[PDB]
Amino acid sequence: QTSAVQQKLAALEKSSGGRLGVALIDTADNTQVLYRGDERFPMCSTSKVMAAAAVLKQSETQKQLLNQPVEIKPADLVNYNPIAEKHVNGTMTLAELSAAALQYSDNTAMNKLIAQLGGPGGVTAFARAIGDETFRLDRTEPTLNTAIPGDPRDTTTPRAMAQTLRQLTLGHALGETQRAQLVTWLKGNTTGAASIRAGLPTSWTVGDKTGSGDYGTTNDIAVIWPQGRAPLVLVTYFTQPQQNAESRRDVLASAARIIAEGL
Numbered sequence: 001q002t003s004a005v006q007q008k009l010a011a012l013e014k015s016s017g018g019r020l021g022v023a024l025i026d027t028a029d030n031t032q033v034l035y036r037g038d039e040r041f042p043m044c045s046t047s048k049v050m051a052a053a054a055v056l057k058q059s060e061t062q063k064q065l066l067n068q069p070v071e072i073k074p075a076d077l078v079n080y081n082p083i084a085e086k087h088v089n090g091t092m093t094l095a096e097l098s099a100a101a102l103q104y105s106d107n108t109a110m111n112k113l114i115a116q117l118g119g120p121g122g123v124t125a126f127a128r129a130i131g132d133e134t135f136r137l138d139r140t141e142p143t144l145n146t147a148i149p150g151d152p153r154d155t156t157t158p159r160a161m162a163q164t165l166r167q168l169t170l171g172h173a174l175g176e177t178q179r180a181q182l183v184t185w186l187k188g189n190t191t192g193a194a195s196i197r198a199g200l201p202t203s204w205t206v207g208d209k210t211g212s213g214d215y216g217t218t219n220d221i222a223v224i225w226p227q228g229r230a231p232l233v234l235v236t237y238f239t240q241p242q243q244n245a246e247s248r249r250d251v252l253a254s255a256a257r258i259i260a261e262g263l
């Protein structure tokens with residue numbers, strides 16, 4: 001059975017030619033609205049939230065960890081390094097790496113966060129520690145974005161990611177200073193204007209992280225503060241049948257617009 005919200009999302013999915021996954025958590029009453037909410041999707045750069053959060057967790061018991069400089073060598077650069085390239089033969093602190101990963105989607109910065117955690121399994125291990133039993137990070141940048149249909153590597157479900165994003169930003173999976181820091185980072189994202197944000201009332205505050213990959217995978221995860229009512233968490237994942245499909249950030253905007261109706 002489906003609600004009119006789900007029917008609208010199914011129609012958007014049909015017209016787009018792809019596979020759409022949505023999870024909304026309304027924290028006023030802890031209801032969820034799901035569309036393919038227990039199906040796996042490739043996370044692409046939305047996984048940078050879990051990596052940054054895992055480093056924030058480490059910093060709860062190593063007070064200055066975020067301010068630790070990390071060397072950036074020429075060989076560390078991968079395919080998209082808008083911030084790290086400025087620091088080759090220099091340094092970036094773990095805070096600077098987290099900001100670059102989250103707010104610019106810098107892939108060298110993500111690889112440094114993964115290294116800090118001991119490899120992709122360190123990110124997964126943090127997920128498990130905060131009760132996310134679904135997330136898995138298998139690979140580093142850039143290969144975590146291959147997004148092959150049905151491949152479980154580097155995937156999660158919309159429901160799981162919404163539950164976790166809620167725990168990280170509105171709950172207490174992180175300590176007080178750390179939660180606030182994650183929210184500050186997410187709110188300042190520079191890559192999200194065409195995705196969830198484009199579908200929401202303009203007076204709302206939004207923290208988000210986008211992702212993009214092969215198979216035209218186009219993703220966004222967000223914490224949202226509507227005007228006058230309790231915050232929301234919204235996950236929108238989208239992927240397509242052909243390897244070289246174009247991005248479809250508008251699909252995510254349209255999913256957000258649908259979900260916002262009646263909110």
Ligand SMILES: OC[C@H]1O[C@@](CO)(O[C@H]2O[C@H](CO)[C@@H](O)[C@H](O)[C@H]2O)[C@@H](O)[C@@H]1O
Pocket residue numbers: 075076077078108110111112114115119140141
């Ligand atoms: O930034 C370097 C740091 O990233 C890791 C992954 O956490 O390795 C990635 O970057 C290397 C250098 O560009 C690649 O050769 C490697 O395949 C890639 O995973 C760490 O191993 C490395 O210390």
